[PDB]
């Protein structure tokens, strides 16, 4: 039940975009084909597509510049699934503060 520390991203990033933020992976993907996805507002809920996660690497990226005066915090969950779509473990909550 370790909580991943919140990421802090300054607003007005000049990118380039997509801008790689941090790798979010499950140690077990090395010896088990895993698929990563992210869910939540900023991902698959309004606002949509501000954060994407590369399915095999778990590399999470931001797609455009942020604005702390519009949205100051994002809360997403990353998920890891096997070859048949079964989640191999509980989703990890991800907190992103726009600074």
Binding residues: 11, 67, 69
Cα distance between residue 35 and residue 49, in whole Å: 18
From the list 77, 86, 31, the residue with the least C-alpha distance to 51 is 77
- 23-62 residues in contact with a second copy (CB under 8 A) are 23-28
> Which region among 16-24, 41-49, 65-73 touches a second copy (by CB under 8 A)?
16-24
99 binds a second copy (CB under 8 A): no
Q: Which two tokens stand for residue 61?
A: 């990226």
Burial of 38 (0-12, 13-18, 19+ CB in 10 A): buried
Comparing CB distances to a second copy, the nearer of 69 and 86 is: 86
Footprint on this chain of a second copy (rule: CB under 8 A)? 1-5, 22-28, 78, 80, 89, 92
């Amino acid at each position: 039940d370790w909580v991943i520390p919140p990421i802090n991203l300054p607003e007005n990033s000049r990118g380039p975009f997509p801008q790689e933020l941090v790798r979010i992976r499950s140690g077990r993907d090395k010896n088990l084909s895993l698929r990563y996805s992210v869910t939540g507002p900023g991902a698959d809920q309004p606002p949509t597509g501000i954060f994407i996660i590369n399915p095999i690497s778990g590399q999470l990226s931001v797609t455009k510049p942020l604005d702390r005066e519009l949205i100051a915090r994002f809360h997403l969950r990353a998920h890891a699934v096997d070859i048949n779509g079964n989640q191999v473990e509980n989703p990890i909550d991800i907190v992103i503060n726009v600074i």
